[PDB]
Amino acid sequence: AYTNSFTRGVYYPDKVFRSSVLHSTQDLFLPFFSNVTWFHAIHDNPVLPFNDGVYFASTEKSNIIRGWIFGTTLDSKTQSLLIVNNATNVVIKVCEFQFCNDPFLGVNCTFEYVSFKNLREFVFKNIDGYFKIYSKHTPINLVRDLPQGFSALEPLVDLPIGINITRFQTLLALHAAYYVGYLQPRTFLLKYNENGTITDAVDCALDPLSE
Amino acid sequence: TKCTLKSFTVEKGIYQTSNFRVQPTESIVRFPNITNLCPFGEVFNATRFASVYAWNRKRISNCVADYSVLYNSASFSTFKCYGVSPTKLNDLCFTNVYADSFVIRGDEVRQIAPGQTGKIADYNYKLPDDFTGCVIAWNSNNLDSKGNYNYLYRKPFERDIYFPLQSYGFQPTNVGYQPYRVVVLSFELLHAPATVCGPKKSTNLVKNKCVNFNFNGLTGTGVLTESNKKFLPFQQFGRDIADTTDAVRDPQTLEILDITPCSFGGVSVITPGTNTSNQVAVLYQGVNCTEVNVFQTRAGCLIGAEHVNNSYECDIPIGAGICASYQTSQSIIAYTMSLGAENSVAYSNNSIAIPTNFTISVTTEILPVSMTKTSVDCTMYICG
Amino acid sequence: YTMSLGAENSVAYSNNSIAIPTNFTISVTTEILPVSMTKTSVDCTMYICGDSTECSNLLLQYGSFCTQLNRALTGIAVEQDKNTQEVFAQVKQIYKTPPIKDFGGFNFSQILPDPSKPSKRSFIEDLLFNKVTKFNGLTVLPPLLTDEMIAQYTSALLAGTITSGWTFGAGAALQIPFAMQMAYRFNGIGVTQNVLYENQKLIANQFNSAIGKIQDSLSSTASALGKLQDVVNQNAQALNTLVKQLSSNFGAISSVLNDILSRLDKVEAEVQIDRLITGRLQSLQTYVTQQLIRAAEIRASANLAATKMSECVLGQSKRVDFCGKGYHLMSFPQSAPHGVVFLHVTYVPAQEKNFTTAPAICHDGKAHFPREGVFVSNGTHWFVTQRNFYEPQIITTDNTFVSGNCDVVIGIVNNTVYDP
Amino acid sequence: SALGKLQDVVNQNAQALNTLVKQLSSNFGAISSVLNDILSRLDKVEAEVQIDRLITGRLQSLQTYVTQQLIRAAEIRASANLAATKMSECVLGQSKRVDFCGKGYHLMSFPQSAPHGVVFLHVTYVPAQEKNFTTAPAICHDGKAHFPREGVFVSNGTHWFVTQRNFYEPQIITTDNTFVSGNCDVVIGIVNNTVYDP
Amino acid sequence: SALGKLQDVVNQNAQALNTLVKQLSSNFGAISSVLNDILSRLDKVEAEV
């Protein structure tokens, strides 16, 4: 199953304030109106490829989605990035894990880090050995599917892991729905408003008018 | 004016001499108030380093480092740096520093640089082609030889965990065939929140006054002011269209300071010809007289010319309808220029004026037609 | 689609057919000319080096490149005042209009000054000023003449033009009644001046209505002033390009000169700073070169506007399409941001009739030719008529001249010539 | 101060050549401004790096000179095209173009040569001693409205005359210096005066 | 030779384009005028200069 991503999946490209300006940037963004795979949090968490990087999102009222897995073989023959996140606390590890038969929470370990009504949006990418995370939360009026409109994802976390990634997977919970899109090297033009918020963008390779 | 024109005689006019600039009153230092000395003892003086197939990265954060404690030491066989010079590192600061700690054969140090290739640089320790930071290396035969084959070898900052597994016979009798320790310091020199800094002591903050400043290693000069610019929590600096820094969050008290450059403008010098007088007036172009008799024109603050309520033909044009002249006991005066005498044409629906006599005017018009026909042998000009 | 060049038209030519216009329209047409551009001074040392002394000492190695860039921009800037002076200061005295506007029914109130305005612009100059729209060593210098002084010059040009005709260009302004000035403007297009006095209220209404259309056009149509807005936009685009080029690396480790000076020690820093100096100096040379070429285009437009002021406003022009389309009567200058607007008043002939025509007429064996105008027939009778307005006059020895006899002229016709 | 347009053209070209010569004193980042210092102090592998800084800066200096001479030559050509038009219209002609050949109504121009230029001595008629008169657009006679063939109807207070526009010469109003068109009632401000029949 | 002003404009614009094309054969101090020689002979950091 699939849906149209619309104008979703854009993030603040660097940690510099800008305002009342149209700023060009080239980075791994989610392409506008891209064809993004859809999944349900009940009765759907296979292993996906990671490609250059991922946009991940979930329409929610119940906090069932609680983390991710990344790496190459995922089978203890490698270090493998684990991210557990329950929206109050976070645990991150790269250790040589073997994961359980069904990845849900029942309600050489060289790196570690610790800390429908709603849509959570995330972006994940790996560049020069650094693994990067961004996010946003919003209320939603569309009950059924991934919504139209624009609001950018702020950065969260950046990890010096030095590790290869080509596959990923997600963690559920038991006593919502989720989406996967792939980032691509794209020039975007970003509208920073008077309050330095990115309020609009142009995907320069979408169509000839955008170019 | 004489030095600007490279002449001892100067004609009647207005001459743009050197740009006036308000000078920095004080030098301000604003750094994170973080007290820990950095754990560089755990970097350089760990009992055994990791093998280069599986090199170890230590994150340094939330501390002060005096890089002179490293760079002044006779212990290091090289301290080559890229994008930064080792003498400057105390004046400058970073989001994080990463120390890559590992051992190599002493011959192999050549491979540890941006853009290099070979059985380390293309295999197990690829640096970025635009690496910023320092490669520090030294002979460790007295520490790491035994041989000690455990120093195994096998994209940027990849760890390399038939197969290419290889070893060195590090024995104390080996000179290039001896073990060498390497620490590569990689500096996360982003315009983002700093946590590893040099020992530079922070001053008090100063506002509404032109100052030289240093924020986390960003040097500049300007008037610091309070601002409405809503920085999001991840943002530490703001930029102008030129990419010059336009605002900063103060690293100790999290308020957003807007930066304005210290006031500047051309010093136009107004002179009658030196043939008539050495008396002179000065226009500070676009400057306000509170920032520098004195007269505020819209063209700038004008000083040494008397403002006059009369109006005359324009002698020396200042701008925005103002001109200056040398007039009475002589003095420089500044006035609104007269466009011409006012005239009511005696119009009515039945009145005509007819000229009863004439004058033959002869008037001289002068037109350029040619200019000096130069030719330059560009080979004899350039190469003589 | 293939573009249309215009509607196709066979002109109804024959060896004996003429079309004469039986009525006219007073067109007022708007011509817009650039006259000046924004006067920029760039401190090349503050643009290139940003008040770094370290960079400023490297910029001395390049000699007089920086001073000859300032010299070129100063010549451009002084020329903008000269361009503006040559267009507007063509009037030697500040003429003013009378308190009573007894102009024979013509209504200049929308183009003459309004004292309620903060600068005493006209109604149309206020529309023109509404419809057309710093920190890195770049600075903008004010013009010498303020917009209020430009408006006093266009007021004096216009008040001279209305109260005295062309005479204020040739000497002292001689008063003449405006209907009598317009009667001279009619003779200057080969229309006999009784055509004005007999149609004076109609011609005044056509002028007043045509000025009403100028106000409606300028109030409705934001794109009307495109030549002046294009000059403003080119000046802004050139400065924004010059500012954005400060963010370029040119191959240096950073485009920020304070990064280079804080990260690197002197011998390494000087190599990186010289890449910025090289690229910023090339960037500023590119700006000054294209501003010198653009200043030459604005000067050509200002010389044209100064020539339209002299020939269209201070005179009446015989030059076809110089002072708008149609036969030029008169022009009024209005000030606009960085420019001038001429309201070119022109006679356009409007309601043709066809007639039979002859080059000459046979009477008593003599060939008669018209002194002024053309011989025309309505089908049964022959008249002499002025070329540009149908007014049939009886063919008479006073409106004709003899030369030779009937044998020579190709297409002569036999008709009586009256003897008074 | 009269010759300032020609003297400034001489001065601009002298200033441009002096700027071009003085730019030979510039290092452009080389060890010396003097090409013989570089070649007498440095061996070829080191010298060629320093000479390329001089070549780069001197070539940029000469490109700057030639570019500003091309722009200045276009300005002199615009002035020469104007001088060639003033020659044709005002020396070889009489120009009706207002203020093209001096202020006042153009009579004639005389060319005089000058260094790098031409001087036109524009002879012009300037009218000089105004007198005020009452005026009329037209005159009623036998109900006929009369208009002047050439010139204007004026009055000295008691009598009506016709004169040419640019010089006061009161002529008696007659059927020879006037033409009729229609009856009186159409014309705004017509006046009643006898028109003599010669 | 009658149309010399129009042919001069054609010749100047042809001469300007031929000069611009011939300037691709110039080294400007590089090891070759041909950008593919530099990229086939030299590795990144040595080629970029």
Ligand SMILES: *[C@@H]1O[C@H](CO)[C@@H](O[C@@H]2O[C@H](CO)[C@@H](O)[C@H](O)[C@H]2NC(C)=O)[C@H](O)[C@H]1NC(C)=O
């Ligand atoms: C990252 O992991 C992938 C496997 O998921 C590696 O890709 C394989 O590389 C070999 C050569 O080393 C190729 O023959 C295979 O065809 C590749 N397989 C796939 C599925 O692409 C990749 O080389 C690794 N990269 C790094 C930098 O470690």
Ligand SMILES: *[C@@H]1O[C@H](CO)[C@@H](O[C@@H]2O[C@H](CO)[C@@H](O)[C@H](O)[C@H]2NC(C)=O)[C@H](O)[C@H]1NC(C)=O
């Ligand atoms: C000249 O034309 C203007 C309009 O273009 C006339 O101005 C209007 O006059 C009436 C009173 O008669 C006012 O109610 C309007 O508000 C005026 N309009 C504007 C835009 O001011 C003016 O009256 C005319 N002058 C003469 C002498 O007829």
Ligand SMILES: *[C@@H]1O[C@H](CO)[C@@H](O[C@@H]2O[C@H](CO)[C@@H](O)[C@H](O)[C@H]2NC(C)=O)[C@H](O)[C@H]1NC(C)=O
């Ligand atoms: C000459 O043309 C004008 C229009 O330019 C005519 O005047 C108009 O006449 C109509 C009636 O036919 C009126 O409704 C309009 O109000 C008039 N317009 C103006 C501006 O007054 C005029 O009638 C024509 N005259 C002749 C003799 O053909």
Ligand SMILES: *[C@@H]1O[C@H](CO)[C@@H](O[C@@H]2O[C@H](CO)[C@@H](O)[C@H](O)[C@H]2NC(C)=O)[C@H](O)[C@H]1NC(C)=O
């Ligand atoms: C051509 O013009 C003449 C003169 O204007 C016209 O002749 C007059 O016609 C009217 C009736 O329309 C008569 O009352 C007059 O007595 C005629 N005058 C003379 C001197 O004959 C003539 O009708 C016009 N012809 C055409 C074909 O339009």
Ligand SMILES: *[C@@H]1O[C@H](CO)[C@@H](O[C@@H]2O[C@H](CO)[C@@H](O)[C@H](O)[C@H]2NC(C)=O)[C@H](O)[C@H]1NC(C)=O
């Ligand atoms: C114009 O009128 C003249 C006479 O005034 C005409 O000329 C005569 O033509 C007839 C017939 O060809 C001859 O018999 C006469 O001898 C001619 N007389 C003269 C003096 O030449 C002439 O034909 C008329 N033209 C037109 C076009 O009708």
Ligand SMILES: *[C@@H]1O[C@H](CO)[C@@H](O[C@@H]2O[C@H](CO)[C@@H](O)[C@H](O)[C@H]2NC(C)=O)[C@H](O)[C@H]1NC(C)=O
């Ligand atoms: C207007 O001009 C007329 C004609 O030039 C003047 O009339 C003459 O006046 C003198 C005395 O000044 C008499 O001797 C003549 O006999 C008059 N001639 C005629 C034909 O009447 C008249 O005086 C002038 N009026 C003014 C007010 O200057």
Ligand SMILES: *[C@@H]1O[C@H](CO)[C@@H](O[C@@H]2O[C@H](CO)[C@@H](O)[C@H](O)[C@H]2NC(C)=O)[C@H](O)[C@H]1NC(C)=O
């Ligand atoms: C010009 O002269 C005519 C007479 O030739 C004057 O017309 C008379 O004016 C009076 C007063 O209005 C009337 O009672 C008569 O009936 C008119 N007669 C005619 C034949 O129209 C006219 O008023 C004079 N104009 C001026 C400006 O004085």
Ligand SMILES: *[C@@H]1O[C@H](CO)[C@@H](O)[C@H](O)[C@H]1NC(C)=O
């Ligand atoms: C998305 O792509 C798949 C094939 O990869 C296709 O079957 C599906 O119809 C596409 N969806 C849309 C909305 O275009």
Ligand SMILES: *[C@@H]1O[C@H](CO)[C@@H](O)[C@H](O)[C@H]1NC(C)=O
């Ligand atoms: C999130 O997990 C931590 C333990 O990892 C727990 O203390 C916390 O209560 C959890 N939050 C929720 C919302 O259950």
Ligand SMILES: *[C@@H]1O[C@H](CO)[C@@H](O)[C@H](O)[C@H]1NC(C)=O
């Ligand atoms: C760590 O690496 C060693 C070989 O160096 C291996 O024997 C061991 O199994 C690894 N650790 C884990 C948890 O697999």
Ligand SMILES: *[C@@H]1O[C@H](CO)[C@@H](O)[C@H](O)[C@H]1NC(C)=O
């Ligand atoms: C910026 O924020 C203020 C409230 O802090 C708000 O009034 C204003 O409208 C905002 N501007 C924009 C362009 O969102």
Ligand SMILES: *[C@@H]1O[C@H](CO)[C@@H](O)[C@H](O)[C@H]1NC(C)=O
């Ligand atoms: C830094 O100073 C502020 C007060 O200026 C204080 O609140 C904060 O705790 C200090 N931080 C550290 C790391 O001591």
Ligand SMILES: *[C@@H]1O[C@H](CO)[C@@H](O)[C@H](O)[C@H]1NC(C)=O
């Ligand atoms: C490392 O140890 C040596 C003595 O063995 C000492 O001189 C040096 O200062 C130490 N360096 C650090 C960074 O601890």
Ligand SMILES: *[C@@H]1O[C@H](CO)[C@@H](O)[C@H](O)[C@H]1NC(C)=O
């Ligand atoms: C120069 O000075 C002399 C007196 O020394 C004076 O007569 C002359 O007018 C002056 N000329 C100018 C242009 O200043």
Ligand SMILES: *[C@@H]1O[C@H](CO)[C@@H](O)[C@H](O)[C@H]1NC(C)=O
């Ligand atoms: C000049 O500066 C003072 C503040 O120092 C300000 O009050 C005044 O309005 C300014 N005037 C102008 C013309 O800028």
Ligand SMILES: *[C@@H]1O[C@H](CO)[C@@H](O)[C@H](O)[C@H]1NC(C)=O
């Ligand atoms: C100019 O005139 C005003 C009154 O119009 C007066 O108050 C002012 O003091 C005068 N200024 C000078 C400099 O004479």
